[PDB]
């Protein structure tokens, strides 16, 4: 059981597994509660990607920094920014300094960059959580593989805008990948380009889908490169995020995404009291005994 | 509400002068629209609560600036806002220093005053120079009340400040929603279980013209570029000379009231009720408006609670916004 | 440390009007420099709402007579408003209109010989400067007086400050009489007696407090 | 475009005592001076509007709202409806004893909301200025002061001027209203000349108050009493819960039964 598992067709196809129930439960909402956008279009109309395989391309890192700057200027209370690899976060935050960007991100919010010490990460997390509560703005940028996004969960006002930089592919690792893929071709029947896309999307949607605790929590969750729009990679995000991924939001610009973020936060900072939920996204004692509600709950859940 | 209200009300307005005031989300930049609605706010607040006062701080470049001191006449405040259109809005704000100046003035107002601060706050980096949870603990203990009207976002620190000091936090969609929020903060907000219910000693000075063609008068200049005042308003404590009433006594500490200024805010205490709103035709044997003797050419008929007469939409808006009483229940 | 000196100075410099005041008080031999710089640093259910209904307006003479008059007036006005509408004849006699124009002409009744406001603008500017100095000075004096005065603060330190206020008050009256003699003996106009009203009320509150506290001795 | 709203204090008891007085000046010349002022106001300009309200003792019924005898035609129809409306009002009437003093707060309330709806009728090119004449002849009841101030402040906000011709007795609340709203107050010294007072002082509109030299403003008394002994106050004690004027200091606040914190 997990909050993200997608697609469910592949866990019987890996684990030698035959279940009774293969179930996906749709996010039924009385309020939009999240918006995913795929910011895959630079402000210069540069195609945002990570095709270079961690060997830096300058203008794409420029547009990443521009995204982080303007999303800092819009979003409250803590932005979480997942990179691809620690070499790539190393190189990106390197070239956000020689290029004149990172002081402006300082002017809007307080950075807490990650390191692979076990104690320095915990101190950076503690100051990041003491800066989302003592007035100022805090922005935690990490790697989408490590322990930062495995247990350490970001709740109502600690991450409002989970910025997934890049598509996380395991690129550093050796012939263990080639050999596990040759195995999944041969003795299971799962393709090369199927398993790579599955692994990348389970890591990306794993690190994204931590921002939301309940119905009264709202998380902007942006995906920043063009590859998340290409049908197979978008097709393997879970159903409760594809349901709220609009075709207009598909392949936004930076500034169109910033304006969608502003309209999102303004429409979703108003009093959304408990009395707006008893119809749709909540149930009382006596709202259960009605068989019309039973028909509704029959219509919500689906299987695979 | 039929609840206790804070009717003497030293409110204190803290405006941003941030970098984010220059953003163009509103139709002019946020400084201009915010300042225009504060001009409307000072107008309606002095139009509705006469005893109370306002003070305006622009918060600019990590420092706080007491732009207009805590006084009770709209001329100085609106003059200062017409001046403050011309400002620059450079730098990041400072919530620490602005709440410190507002606290520093609002320590020593007497305990029955619901001491209130209204922070019209836009940006997100809340650049304080010290710890701002000890201020919130102090302002919790100093029984002040701080309410923040926010632009573009929800910020956790302003949420903690609003829910802990006692105020209310709100974020802005439009021109109309922002007018609704400032109109919500015009009215006297209800009191907690903490504020003192004292009995302030008051003074009611009569008007005195130049007595009998100035036969043994007392020719004075003023008391706060003044001419030679022949007569006017005295004080019953210190026997000074004031031109305008109501004015807090500048040399005694008495508060001077003409007493329609107590009658200008009596509608809060015996308030209105709801109009039973019914759109359809529905049994109406009284075709004409009991308000202004006109036909009901629309499908909205509004019927009072006690007398249960008939009113139209124009009489609805007029009674519930301005006249503040049912014309039937007087009869 | 000579801190205070540097403060009062820096101020006097930046604030020349205050400097003026400082001279007009200290240099004028009314008080001493040290004193001046020293002290210059819940369901509300209303019980009786009828008290709100007829408010602070005093009780007018409202004596409607015996209810026989109710019946008599109802009879006479029900008979009155039956026969109605003369429009040419009854409305105006022309002599009443001529007397009304006589009244509203500027020498008759309802023209009160009002909005006259006879002023004494003879020597404006330098007398205005004198009065600016005087009202600043007496404002500071009565500021200290009525600021320490109001609550009796029944101990010996506040009573000693009240005695210093009494000394400053008497020498303030002497300096005000000297300023009135040096000012108003130029062209014989411009009653300054409002400042003397303020200082006479300070004099009166001082003697009335003295008699009150001497009654409160035992 | 202007809007005069005459309010005539038709106290049947007062004008009944006036008509048993057998004077020259009865209610007929009062309502006729009202109609001549109304036809004069409609006569001064084509765009002017008129509305005439009559405060009775128990009701605020409006009076307003071919040429047989030579008037202008709409003046004739307006005079016919005002005459027939006062004949339907005053003759067919009632008698009660607990409520016999006249009212003025309700008729002013109807006038305020009438000016509101007639200002919604106005299109974007033109703009409406407005005033309320009050022709008072009776003694106002004190009991509606809580109400009465409210309509004054409505006329303070809605920028409606208030004027008053009082006939017999002075009225502190109504000269108070004409002081607050910016209107004008006048106590007539001789009854039958009433029309000639109205056609020079109260006929001219807002852009003729500033041109004409008018009778000067009487000084307005801001007398204030306690709710305790009704006597005049120069220094009072006012609660911050009840917001009520007390004269002498008392332990337990009577107006709102406040558990008064004592220091
Ligand atoms: Zn005083
Ligand atoms: Zn009613
Ligand atoms: Zn109506
Ligand atoms: Zn009380």
From Swiss-Prot, chain A:
Coiled coil, from the record: none
Sample GO molecular function, one term: 4 iron, 4 sulfur cluster binding
Residue numbers covered by motif Nuclear localization signal: 226-239
Keyword set, alphabetical order: 4Fe-4S, ATP-binding, Cataract, Chromosome partition, Cockayne syndrome, Cytoplasm, Cytoskeleton, Deafness, Disease variant, DNA damage, DNA repair, DNA-binding, Dwarfism, Helicase, Host-virus interaction, Hydrolase, Ichthyosis, Iron, Iron-sulfur, Isomerase, Magnesium, Metal-binding, Nucleotide-binding, Nucleus, Transcription, Transcription regulation, Ubl conjugation, Xeroderma pigmentosum
UniProt GO cellular component terms: CAK-ERCC2 complex; cytoplasm; cytosol; MMXD complex; nucleoplasm; nucleus; spindle; transcription factor TFIID complex
Reported impact of residue 5 to V: In XP-D and TTD1
Outcome of substituting residue 266 to W: In TTD1; no longer interacts with GTF2H2/p44; has 5'-3' helicase activity
Protein's GO biological process: apoptotic process; bone mineralization; central nervous system myelin formation; chromosome segregation; determination of adult lifespan; embryonic cleavage; embryonic organ development; erythrocyte maturation
Outcome of mutating residue 225 to N: In XP-D and COFS2
Domain characteristics, as noted in the entry: Interacts with GTF2H2/p44 via the C-terminus of this protein; mutations in the C-terminal region of XPD do not alter its helicase activity, but prevent its interaction with and helicase stimulation by GTF2H2/p44.
Name assigned to this protein: General transcription and DNA repair factor IIH helicase subunit XPD
The organism of origin for this protein: Homo sapiens
Lineage, top ranks: Eukaryota, Metazoa, Chordata, Craniata, Vertebrata
Gene: ERCC2
UniProtKB/Swiss-Prot annotation, chain B:
Major place of residence: nucleus
Effect of residue 252 to A: Reconstituted TFIIH complex lacks p62 and has no transcriptional activity
InterPro entries per UniProt: C1-like_sf (IPR046349), Ssl1-like (IPR007198), TFIIH_C1-like_dom (IPR004595), TFIIH_SSL1/p44 (IPR012170), VWF_A (IPR002035), vWFA_dom_sf (IPR036465), Znf_C2H2_type (IPR013087), Znf_RING/FYVE/PHD (IPR013083)
GO MF annotations, alphabetized: RNA polymerase II general transcription initiation factor activity; zinc ion binding
Protein name: General transcription factor IIH subunit 2
A matching Pfam family: C1_4
UniProt tissue specificity: Widely expressed, with higher expression in skeletal muscle.
Cellular location(s): Nucleus
Recorded consequence of changing residue 324 to A: No effect on the transcriptional activity of the reconstituted TFIIH complex
Keyword Transport among record annotations: no
Effect in UniProt of substituting residue 320 to A: No effect on the transcriptional activity of the reconstituted TFIIH complex
Alphabetic keyword roster: DNA damage, DNA repair, Host-virus interaction, Metal-binding, Nucleus, Phosphoprotein, Transcription, Transcription regulation, Zinc, Zinc-finger
Annotated signal peptide: none
Effect of residue 289 to A: No effect on the transcriptional activity of the reconstituted TFIIH complex
Listed SMART domains: C1_4 (SM01047), VWA (SM00327)
Modified residues (Phosphotyrosine): 45
Recorded GO CC terms: core TFIIH complex portion of holo TFIIH complex; nuclear speck; nucleoplasm; nucleus; transcription factor TFIID complex; transcription factor TFIIH core complex; transcription factor TFIIH holo complex
Gene name of the encoded protein: GTF2H2
Keyword match Lipoprotein: no
Family statement: Belongs to the GTF2H2 family.
UniProtKB/Swiss-Prot annotation, chain C:
Post-translational modification: (Microbial infection) Upon Rift valley fever virus infection, interacts with NSs leading to ubiquitination by the NSs-FBXO3 E3 ligase and proteasome-dependent degradation.
GO BP terms in the entry: DNA repair; hormone-mediated signaling pathway; nucleotide-excision repair; positive regulation of DNA-templated transcription; regulation of cyclin-dependent protein serine/threonine kinase activity; transcription by RNA polymerase I; transcription by RNA polymerase II; transcription initiation at RNA polymerase II promoter
GO function term, MF aspect, one: chromatin binding
Main location: nucleus
Keywords recorded for this protein, A-Z: Acetylation, DNA damage, DNA repair, Host-virus interaction, Nucleus, Phosphoprotein, Repeat, Transcription, Transcription regulation, Ubl conjugation
Role according to the record: Component of the general transcription and DNA repair factor IIH (TFIIH) core complex, which is involved in general and transcription-coupled nucleotide excision repair (NER) of damaged DNA and, when complexed to CAK, in RNA transcription by RNA polymerase II. In NER, TFIIH acts by opening DNA around the lesion to allow the excision of the damaged oligonucleotide and its replacement by a new DNA fragment. In transcription, TFIIH has an essential role in transcription initiation.
Protein name, entry field: General transcription factor IIH subunit 1
Organism: Homo sapiens
Swiss-Prot record, chain D:
GO molecular function, one term: zinc ion binding
tRNA processing recorded as keyword: no
Pfam families on file: Tfb4 (PF03850)
Cellular location(s): Nucleus
Lineage top rank: taxon: Eukaryota
Listed GO biological process terms: DNA repair; nucleotide-excision repair; regulation of DNA-templated transcription; transcription by RNA polymerase II
Zinc finger residue extent: C4-type: 239-256
Cystine crosslinks: none
GO cellular component, as recorded: core TFIIH complex portion of holo TFIIH complex; nucleoplasm; nucleus; transcription factor TFIID complex; transcription factor TFIIH core complex; transcription factor TFIIH holo complex; transcription preinitiation complex
Keywords: DNA damage, DNA repair, Metal-binding, Nucleus, Transcription, Transcription regulation, Zinc, Zinc-finger
Family stated for the protein in its record: Belongs to the TFB4 family.
Record's subunit section: Part of a TFIID-containing RNA polymerase II pre-initiation complex that is composed of TBP and at least GTF2A1, GTF2A2, GTF2E1, GTF2E2, GTF2F1, GTF2H2, GTF2H3, GTF2H4, GTF2H5, GTF2B, TCEA1, ERCC2, ERCC3, TAF1, TAF2, TAF3, TAF4, TAF5, TAF6, TAF7, TAF8, TAF9, TAF10, TAF11, TAF12 and TAF13. Component of the 7-subunit TFIIH core complex composed of XPB/ERCC3, XPD/ERCC2, GTF2H1, GTF2H2, GTF2H3, GTF2H4 and GTF2H5, which is active in NER.
NCBIfam families from the UniProt entry: tfb4
Protein name: General transcription factor IIH subunit 3
Species: Homo sapiens (Human)
Lineage start: Eukaryota, Metazoa, Chordata, Craniata, Vertebrata
């Amino acid at each position: 059981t997990s909050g993200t598992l997608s697609p469910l067709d592949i866990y019987p196809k890996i684990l030698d597994f035959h279940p009774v129930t293969m179930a996906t439960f749709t996010m039924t909402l009385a309020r939009v509660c999240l918006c995913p956008m795929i910011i895959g279009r630079g402000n210069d109309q540069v195609a945002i990607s990570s095709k270079f395989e961690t060997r830096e391309d300058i203008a794409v890192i420029r547009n990443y920094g521009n995204l982080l700057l303007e999303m800092s200027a819009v979003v409250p209370d803590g932005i979480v920014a997942f990179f691809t690899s620690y070499q790539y976060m190393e190189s990106t935050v390197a070239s956000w300094y020689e290029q004149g960007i990172l002081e402006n991100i300082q002017r809007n919010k307080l950075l807490f960059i990650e390191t692979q010490d076990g104690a320095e990460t915990s101190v950076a997390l503690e100051k990041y959580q003491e800066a989302c509560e003592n007035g100022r703005g805090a922005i935690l940028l990490s790697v989408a593989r490590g322990k930062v996004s495995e247990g350490i969960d970001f709740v109502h006002h600690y991450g409002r805008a989970v910025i997934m930089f890049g598509v996380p592919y395991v690129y550093t690792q050796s012939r263990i990948l080639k050999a596990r893929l040759e195995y999944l071709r041969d003795q299971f029947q799962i393709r090369e380009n199927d398993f790579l896309t599955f692994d990348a999307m389970r890591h990306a949607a794993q690190c994204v889908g931590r921002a939301i605790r309940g119905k009264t929590d709202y998380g902007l969750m942006v995906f920043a490169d063009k590859r998340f729009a290409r049908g197979d990679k978008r097709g393997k995000l879970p159903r409760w995020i594809q349901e709220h991924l609009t075709d207009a939001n598909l392949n936004l610009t930076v500034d169109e995404g910033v304006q969608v973020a502003k309209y999102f936060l303004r429409q979703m900072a108003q009093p959304f009291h408990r009395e707006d939920q008893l119809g749709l996204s909540l149930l009382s004692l006596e709202q259960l005994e009605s068989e019309e509600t039973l028909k509704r709950i029959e219509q919500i859940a689906q299987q695979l | 509400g039929q609840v206790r209200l804070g009717m003497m009300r030293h409110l204190y307005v803290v405006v941003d002068g941030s970098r984010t005031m220059e953003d163009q989300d509103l139709k002019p930049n946020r400084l201009t629209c915010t300042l225009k609605l504060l001009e409307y706010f000072v107008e309606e607040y002095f139009d509705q609560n006469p005893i109370s006062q306002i003070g305006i701080i622009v918060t600019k470049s990590k420092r706080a600036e007491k732009l207009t001191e805590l006084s009770g006449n709209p001329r100085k405040h609106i003059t200062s806002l017409k001046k403050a259109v011309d400002m620059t809005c450079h730098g990041e704000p400072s919530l620490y220093n602005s709440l410190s100046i507002a606290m520093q003035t609002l320590k020593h107002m007497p305990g029955h005053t619901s001491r209130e601060v209204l922070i019209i706050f836009s940006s997100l980096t809340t650049c304080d120079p010290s710890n701002i949870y000890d201020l919130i603990k102090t302002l919790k203990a100093a029984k002040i009340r701080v309410s923040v009207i926010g632009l573009s976002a929800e910020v956790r620190v302003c949420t903690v400040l609003a829910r802990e000091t006692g105020g209310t936090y709100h974020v802005i969609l439009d021109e109309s929603h922002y007018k609704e929020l400032l109109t919500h903060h015009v009215s006297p907000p209800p009191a907690s279980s903490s504020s003192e219910c004292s009995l302030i000693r008051m003074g009611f000075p009569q008007h005195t013209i130049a007595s009998l063609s100035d036969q043994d008068a007392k020719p004075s200049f003023s008391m706060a570029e003044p001419g030679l005042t022949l007569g006017g308003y005295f004080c019953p404590q210190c026997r000074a000379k004031y031109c305008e009433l109501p004015v807090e006594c500048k040399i005694c500490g008495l508060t001077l009231v003409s007493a329609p200024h107590l009658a200008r805010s009596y509608h809060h205490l015996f308030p209105l009720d709801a109009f039973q709103e019914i759109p359809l035709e529905e049994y109406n044997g009284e075709r004409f408006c009991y308000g202004c003797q006109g036909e009901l050419k629309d499908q909205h008929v509004y019927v009072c609670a006690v007398c249960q007469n008939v009113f139209c939409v124009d009489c609805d808006v007029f009674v519930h916004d301005s006249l503040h009483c049912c014309p039937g229940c007087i009869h | 440390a000579n801190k205070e000196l540097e403060e009062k100075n820096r101020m006097l410099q930046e604030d020349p009007v205050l400097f003026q005041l400082y001279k007009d008080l200290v240099v004028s031999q009314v008080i001493s420099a040290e004193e001046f710089w020293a002290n210059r640093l819940i369901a509300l259910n209303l019980k009786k709402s009828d008290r709100y209904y007829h408010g602070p307006t005093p009780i007018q003479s409202l004596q409607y007579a015996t209810s026989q008059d109710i019946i008599n007036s109802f009879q006479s006005i029900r008979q009155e408003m039956e026969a109605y509408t003369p429009k040419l004849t009854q409305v105006l006699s022309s002599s009443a209109a001529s007397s009304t124009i006589t009244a509203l002409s500027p020498g008759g009744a309802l023209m009160q010989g009002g909005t006259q406001q006879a002023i004494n603008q003879m020597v404006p500017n330098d007398i205005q400067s004198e009065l600016k100095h005087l009202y600043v000075a007496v404002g500071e004096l009565l500021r200290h007086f009525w600021s320490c005065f109001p609550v009796n603060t029944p101990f010996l330190e506040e009573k000693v400050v009240k005695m210093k206020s009494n000394l400053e008050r008497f020498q303030v009256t002497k300096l005000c009489p000297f300023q009135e003699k040096i000012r108003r003996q130029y062209l014989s106009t411009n009653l300054v007696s409002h400042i003397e009203e303020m200082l006479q009320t300070a004099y009166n509150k001082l003697h009335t407090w003295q008699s009150r506290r001497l009654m409160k001795k035992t | 475009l202007n809007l005069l709203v005459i309010v005539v204090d038709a106290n049947p008891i007062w004008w009944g005592k006036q008509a048993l007085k057998e004077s020259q000046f009865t209610l007929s010349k009062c309502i006729d001076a009202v109609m001549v002022l109304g036809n004069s106001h409609l006569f001064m300009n084509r765009s002017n509007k008129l509305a005439v309200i009559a405060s009775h003792i128990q009701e605020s019924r409006f009076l307003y709202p071919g040429s047989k005898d030579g008037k202008y035609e709409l003046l004739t129809s307006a005079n016919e409806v005002i005459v027939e409306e006062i004949k339907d009002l005053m003759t067919k009437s009632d008698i009660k004893g607990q409520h016999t003093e006249t009212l003025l707060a309700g008729s002013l309330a109807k006038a305020l909301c009438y000016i509101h709806r007639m200002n919604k009728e106005v299109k974007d090119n033109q703009e409406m200025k407005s005033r309320i004449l009050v022709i008072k002849a009776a003694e106002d009841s004190a009991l509606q002061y809580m109400n009465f101030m409210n309509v004054i402040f409505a006329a303070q906000k809605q920028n409606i001027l208030i004027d008053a011709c009082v006939l017999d007795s002075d009225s502190g609340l109504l000269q108070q209203a004409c002081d607050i709203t910016g209107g004008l107050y006048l106590k007539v010294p001789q009854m039958p000349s009433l029309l000639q007072y109205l056609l020079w002082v109260f006929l001219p509109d807002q852009d003729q108050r500033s041109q004409l030299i008018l009778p000067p403003p009487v000084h307005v008394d801001y007398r204030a009493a306690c709710f305790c002994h009704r006597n005049l106050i120069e220094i009072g004690y006012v609660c911050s819960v009840c917001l009520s004027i007390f004269c002498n200091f008392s332990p337990i606040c009577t107006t709102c039964e406040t558990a008064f914190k004592i220091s």
